[PDB]
Amino acid sequence: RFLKVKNWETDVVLTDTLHLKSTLETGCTEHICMGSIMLPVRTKDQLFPLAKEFLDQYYSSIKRFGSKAHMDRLEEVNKEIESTSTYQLKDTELIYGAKHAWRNASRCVGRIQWSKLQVFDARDCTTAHGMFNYICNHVKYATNKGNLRSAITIFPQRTDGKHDFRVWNSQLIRYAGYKQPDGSTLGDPANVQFTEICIQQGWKAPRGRFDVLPLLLQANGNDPELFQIPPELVLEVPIRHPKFDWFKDLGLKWYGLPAVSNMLLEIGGLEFSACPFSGWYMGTEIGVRDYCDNSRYNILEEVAKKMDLDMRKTSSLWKDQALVEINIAVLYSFQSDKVTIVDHHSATESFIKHMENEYRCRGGCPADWVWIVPPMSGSITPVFHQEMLNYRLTPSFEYQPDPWNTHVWKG
Amino acid sequence: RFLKVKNWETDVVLTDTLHLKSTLETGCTEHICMGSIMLPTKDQLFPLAKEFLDQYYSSIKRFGSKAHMDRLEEVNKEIESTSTYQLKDTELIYGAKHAWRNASRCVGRIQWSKLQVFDARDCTTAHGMFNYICNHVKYATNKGNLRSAITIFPQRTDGKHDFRVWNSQLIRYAGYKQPDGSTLGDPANVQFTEICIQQGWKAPRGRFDVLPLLLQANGNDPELFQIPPELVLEVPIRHPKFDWFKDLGLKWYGLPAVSNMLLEIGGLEFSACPFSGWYMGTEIGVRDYCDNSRYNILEEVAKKMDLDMRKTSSLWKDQALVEINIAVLYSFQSDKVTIVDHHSATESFIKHMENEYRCRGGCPADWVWIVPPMSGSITPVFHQEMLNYRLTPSFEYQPDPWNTHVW
Ligand code: HEM
Ligand code: HEM
Ligand SMILES: Cc1cc(N)nc(CCc2cccc([C@@H](O)Cc3cc(C)cc(N)n3)c2)c1
Ligand SMILES: Cc1cc(N)nc(CCc2cccc([C@@H](O)Cc3cc(C)cc(N)n3)c2)c1
Ligand SMILES: C[C@H](O)[C@H](O)[C@H]1CNc2nc(N)[nH]c(=O)c2N1
Ligand SMILES: C[C@H](O)[C@H](O)[C@H]1CNc2nc(N)[nH]c(=O)c2N1
Ligand SMILES: [Zn+2]
C-alpha cells in the first residue's frame, strides 16, 4: 500500500512505500496518536530473523543480493549464533549499520549529512581507561579546530546484559549544575543529578557556572570511573552580540561539539549500549533551548532586562524579542570563531531537499514533525508546511534507561 | 491502557482515562504515525444516537432515569419511522459546546462552555441564511468585545438538500492574480474570489476587499450577499515604536468565524454551522501576513527595519516576525477589539488541560496544532505531552462545495 505526503506551501506531493519495510512499532493505534509523547536480553529465537533482515539490506546496498558471499555470510552468522548465542559484525557491516541508524533517525533534521560519518570501531576496548582514550581521539578528531566533522565511536555490544559498556554522560561535553540550599541552581539545571553522582564518585567540583563535567565511564559491566577531558580538547565559544556590547558581560559561553552518548545503536539485533556520536549544532539548540528554556539557564529575564523591554505584560512579546537577540548572538559568536554551526532556516531548507531526494532514491524518509520543526519561528521555515510520516526502521538509535537506575554496584 | 502524560518543564503528570471512550479513528496505526497529516442508515444511526443521549443524560446526572429511557424510546421510534431524528434544544446546545470541547486542535477551549448557540434549524433560503449570519456576526463582534457563538442550519437529510456556506470563513479578504504574474490581496482566497466573479460579484479590485457571502440552502444553486460593511469590524495595523509601519497600509478583520466545517451530533450531520470566537495574535501576524503563500510581507517589513538581508543567519525574518506580531497585538488592543497573545492562550490551555484531567479524566489535544507557529519552546504547551484522539460530538472537515454541488 502506497502513502502520500503533501507540502502545503508548494503543493508538492510525494509517495512513501518505504514504510512497508517497517519493523518496530510507533506507540500509536487507530484510536490514539502518541506522536508527542517524548519516550515511546535477546534469545537466538528472536536474533536470527533480525540478523538475516539486516544482512539482506546490507547486501542489496552493495548490490550483491543472493551472491555466494551473501549466502556464506548468512550461513556463517547462523553458525555463530547457534554456537555462541550472538554474533560479530564485519567492519563494513558496522560502518553501514551506523550510517543507516542515523539515516533512519526520524527526529534528526541533520540527516542530509548521513553518508559522511566517521565511524570509530572501539570493539577491542576492555577498560574505562581504554574508553577515555577512544573518546579523547573522538573529541579531537570531530572538533578539528572548529571545522567540525561527524563521527561516532562504537564500543563492544551487549552480551548477557551483565557486561555492559556505558557512557554515563548524556553528552561527552556538557556543563555542571549545582542545586544551592536556597533553591537556585548554579550552572545548567539539566545536569544537576548527574553532577551529584560525579561529586559522589569523588570528582572535585570547581562549582562555577560553566564547569565541564568529567566523563564517567563503565566498561564490561564494571563500576564506572571518572576522567577529565583535557581542556585543550574542549572547544568553547564566548557569547557576544554584534550590536549589543553588554551582551558579553552576561558571562556566557558554550561548547562547540554536540556529542550524544546515552543512546543505543541496534544493528541486526545487536545492541551497542555505548556509541557516543557527534555532529555540529543548529543555533536554536543553544539559543532557544539551552539558554531559554525556563528549566535551563533561563536568561530571557536578564537579557530582556538589559534591553529595557516592557516586561510588565507578556503581550509586549518581550520574551520573543530577547529570544531572537540571543539566537543572533549564538550564531554570530560561532561564525566569528570559525566553529561550524547551522541556522534553522538553512538546516530546515537542507532537510526538505534531503527528504525529497530520500523519497526519490529510497521510497521514503521517516520524519517526526514534532521534533524536526525548530523551537522558534516554526512557520517561517519550510518544514512546518511539510506533511511527514513517522515510522521506525532498523538499524536505529534507541533510548535506554539511565545506568544509575539499573547498575549492579560491585563496590 | 490508563495512559500518562508528562510536562517536561514542570514534571506534572496527568493520567488519561477519557481516551477509552474514543469512537472515531486517527489515521495512525501500530506501524505509522500520521500526527502531521492535515486531512486524514437506520442501522448505524441508532447506536450513534444512543451513545450521544447516554452522555447527555449522564452530564445532567439523570443517567438511567425515567426521562432518559423515554427519550431513548422516543428517538428510537422516530428513527424507525422517519430515518432520522431531531434534537431537543437542550441537546443541541450540549452537542455544540461539546463539539468544541472535543476539538483537539483548538487552543482556545478553556472557554468551551460559554458558546452562544443560535438555532437556525427553521431556516429555508439563502436570504434566510444571510439574515441569520448577519445576526451572528453582529452579536459575536459586539463592538469589539467579541463573544463566542455558532449558528446551526438544518441537518443533512438525503444529502441532496444540503445547507452549505461556501466561504471557508464568513469574513475573508479577496485575492486576484494579475497580468504581472503575482497576486493582489490574499493569495489563499484566489480560487474562491474567482468563483464569486464567475458568479457575478463586481470586485472593488483592492487588497483588503471583504468577500461576498455565497450561500446554499436546501441544495440549491448558491447566492451572493454583501455583509453590511458596518458589521465587519476591521483593525488598522500600526506599531508602538515604528511610525512607518502604518504606511504599509495593513488591516485585519476582528472576527475569526469558521464556516466550512461539519458538525456531528448523535450521528446527525450539520453541514452549515459557522462558528466564531476571537483571534490569537499569531494567526494574523505569523500566518496571514508572513506565510509565503499568503501576504508574505516579511521581505518588505525587514527592509523598513534596515536589517541585514544578505544571509539567513542574521535572523532578519525572525526579527521582523516578532515586530509584526507586536504590531497586531498592539493595534487590536488599542482599538479595544478582543485578542489573545500566544503566551497567554497557551498558559490558559495548560490550565484548561489541568481542569479537564481532573474533571473529565482527560483532554484530547493535537500537539502539532496547539504549539504556536512562532516562539514554540518558550510557551508551556511545547513541553506538554498531549494525547490525541477523536471524540464525538465533533467538527469535521468536508469537501469544497464546488467540487460536489450539482450546478
Ligand atoms: C550534522 C550535525 C547535526 C545537526 C545540526 C543535527 C540536528 C539535530 C537536532 C536539532 C535534533 C533534535 C535535538 C533537540 O533539539 O533536542 C537531532 C536529533 C537526533 N539526531 Fe541529529 N543532528 C546532527 C548530526 C547527527 C549525527 C552525526 C547523529 C548520529 C549519527 C544524529 C542522530 C540524532 C538522533 C538519534 C536524534 C534523536 C534524539 C532523540 O530521539 O532524543 N544527529 N539532531
Ligand atoms: C475563543 C477564541 C478562540 C481562540 C483564540 C481559538 C484558537 C484556535 C487556534 C489557534 C486554532 C488553530 C488554527 C490555525 O492555526 O489555523 C483553532 C482551531 C480550531 N478551533 Fe478554536 N479558538 C477559539 C474559539 C473557537 C470556537 C468558538 C470553536 C467552535 C465552537 C473553535 C473550534 C476550532 C476547530 C474545530 C479548529 C480546527 C479544526 C481542524 O482543523 O481540525 N474554536 N482555534
Ligand atoms: C530532556 C530530554 C528528555 C528526553 N526524553 N530525551 C532527551 C534526548 C533529546 C536530546 C537532548 C539534548 C540533546 C540532544 C541531541 O540530539 C543534540 C544533538 C546531537 C548531535 C549529534 C547533533 C546536534 N546538532 N544536536 C537530544 C532529552
Ligand atoms: C489552507 C487550509 C487547508 C485546510 N485543509 N485546512 C486548513 C485549516 C482550517 C482553518 C484555516 C484557517 C483558520 C481556521 C480557524 O481555526 C481559525 C480560527 C477560528 C476560530 C473560531 C477562532 C480562532 N481564533 N481562529 C481553520 C487550512
Ligand atoms: C504539514 C503540517 O501538518 C501543517 O502545516 C499544519 C501544522 N500545524 C499547524 N498548526 C496550526 N495551528 N495551524 C496550521 O495550519 C497548521 N498546519
Ligand atoms: C512533549 C514533546 O514531545 C517534547 O516537549 C518535545 C517536542 N519537540 C522537541 N523537538 C526537539 N528538537 N527537541 C526536543 O527536546 C523536543 N521536545
Ligand atoms: Zn500518531
Angle between helices A318-336 and B316-334 (to 10 degrees): 170
Q: Is there a contact between B286 and B325 (Cβ–Cβ < 8 Å)? A: yes
CATH class assigned to A124-149+164-235+399-403: alpha beta
What's the CA-to-centroid distance between B28 and ligand 7, angstroms?
5
CB < 8 Å & 24+ apart, contacts of B75-84 = B75/B49, B75/B50, B76/B46, B76/B49, B79/B42, B79/B45, B79/B46, B79/B49, B80/B42, B83/B41, B83/B42, B83/B45, B84/B45, B84/B155, B84/B157, B84/B268
Q: Is there a contact between A389 and A364 (Cβ–Cβ < 8 Å)? A: yes
Q: Is there a contact between B318 and A326 (Cβ–Cβ < 8 Å)? A: no
Q: What is the CATH number of domain A16-123+150-160+264-278+348-372?
A: 3.90.340.10
Query: What gap in Å lies between CA B226 and CA A91, rounded to an integer?
Result: 73
| Order of strands, sheet of B275-276, starting from the edge strand that comes earlier in the sequence | B116-119, B149-152, B275-276, B257-258
Q: Is there a contact between A268 and A81 (Cβ–Cβ < 8 Å)? A: no
Q: Is there a contact between B213 and B133 (Cβ–Cβ < 8 Å)? A: yes
Distances from the Cα of A291 to the Cα of A33, A303, B127, angstroms: 31, 11, 58
Tell me how close the Cα of B121 comes to any Cα of chain A, in angstroms.
Answer: 33
Reading the block at residue A9, the C-alpha cell is 506551501
Query: What gap in Å lies between CA B52 and CA B270, rounded to an integer?
Result: 15
* Resolution limit, Å: 2.2
Identify how the structure was determined. Answer: X-ray
- Residue numbers in B near A34 (CB within 8 A): 33, 387
- The domain covering B16-121+148-158+262-276+346-370 belongs, at the CATH homologous superfamily level, to Nitric Oxide Synthase; Chain A, domain 1 (3.90.340.10)
Tell whether A85 is within 8 A of chain B (Cβ).
no
Q: Is there a contact between A156 and A220 (Cβ–Cβ < 8 Å)? A: yes
Q: What is the CATH number of domain B122-147+162-233+397-401?
A: 3.90.440.10
Q: Is there a contact between A104 and A366 (Cβ–Cβ < 8 Å)? A: yes
Tell whether B37 is within 8 A of chain A (Cβ).
yes
- Report DSSP letters for B333-368, one per residue: HHTT---B-HHHHHHHHHHHHHHHHHHHS-----HH
Task: Say if the Cβ atoms of B315 and A321 lie within 8 Å.
Answer: no
Reading the block at residue B228, the C-alpha cell is 453590511
Cell numbers 532514491 correspond to: A361
Query: What gap in Å lies between CA B242 and CA B306, rounded to an integer?
Result: 12
**How many Cα atoms are found within 13 Å in the side-chain-facing hemisphere of A365?**
27
Q: What are phi and psi of A120, to 5 degrees?
A: -100, 125
Residue A24 DSSP label? S
Closest among B366, B370, B369 to B380, alpha carbons compared: B370
Residues near A182 by Cβ (< 8 Å), separated by ≥ 6?
none
Tell whether B99 is within 8 A of chain A (Cβ).
no
Closest among A380, A204, A391, A13 to B34, alpha carbons compared: A391
H helix runs in B83-147, sequence order? 89-101, 126-141
Chain-centre distance for alpha carbon A398: 10
Q: Which residues surround ligand 7, an ion (CB under 5 A)?
A: A 28, 33, 35; B 28, 33, 35
How do strand A185-187 and strand A225-227 relate by DSSP bridges?
Answer: unpaired
What's the CA-to-centroid distance between A260 and ligand 3, angstroms?
7
Residue B280 DSSP label? B
Q: Is B383 in the pocket of ligand 6 (CB under 6 A)?
A: yes
- Report DSSP letters for A43-85, one per residue: -HHHHHHHHHHHHHHHHHHTT-TT-HHHHHHHHHHHHHHHHHS
Q: Is there a contact between A67 and A59 (Cβ–Cβ < 8 Å)? A: yes
Q: Is there a contact between A47 and A81 (Cβ–Cβ < 8 Å)? A: yes
Cell numbers 444529502 correspond to: B159
Cell numbers 546496498 correspond to: A61
Residue A224 DSSP label? P
Boundaries of every domain in chain B: 16-121+148-158+262-276+346-370, 122-147+162-233+397-401, 234-256+279-344
Closest among A57, A58, A59, A52 to A87, alpha carbons compared: A52
Q: Is there a contact between A327 and A288 (Cβ–Cβ < 8 Å)? A: yes
Query: What gap in Å lies between CA A31 and CA A223, rounded to an integer?
Result: 44
For an interface test with A, give the residue of B293, B305, B310, B378 to mutate (most A CBs within 10 A).
Answer: B378
Reading the block at residue B183, the C-alpha cell is 497576486
Tell whether A296 is within 8 A of chain B (Cβ).
no
Torsion angle of C-alpha atoms B98, B101, B103, B104, degrees rounded to 10: -140
Q: Is there a contact between B132 and B123 (Cβ–Cβ < 8 Å)? A: yes
**How many Cα atoms are found within 13 Å in the side-chain-facing hemisphere of B274?**
26
Task: Say if the Cβ atoms of A314 and B36 lie within 8 Å.
Answer: no
CATH class assigned to A236-258+281-346: alpha beta
Q: Is there a contact between A256 and A278 (Cβ–Cβ < 8 Å)? A: no
Distances from the Cα of A184 to the Cα of A321, A334, A374, B51, angstroms: 25, 29, 29, 52
Cell numbers 498558559 correspond to: B347
Q: What are phi and psi of B130, to 5 degrees?
A: -60, -45
Q: Is B115 in the pocket of ligand 2 (CB under 6 A)?
A: yes
Question: What is the third-level CATH fold of B234-256+279-344?
Answer: 3.90.1230
Amino acid at A338: K
Closest among A247, A242, A234 to A339, alpha carbons compared: A234
Query: What gap in Å lies between CA B53 and CA B360, rounded to an integer?
Result: 17
* Total residue length of chain A: 411
Query: What gap in Å lies between CA B85 and CA B268, rounded to an integer?
Result: 8
- How many contacts does A have with B, using Cβ atoms within 8 A? 205
- Residue A158 burial by CB count (10 A; 0-12/13-18/19+): exposed, middle or buried? buried
Q: How many CB atoms lie within 10 A of CB A65?
A: 13
Q: Is there a contact between A89 and A77 (Cβ–Cβ < 8 Å)? A: no
Is B161 strand, coil or helix?
coil
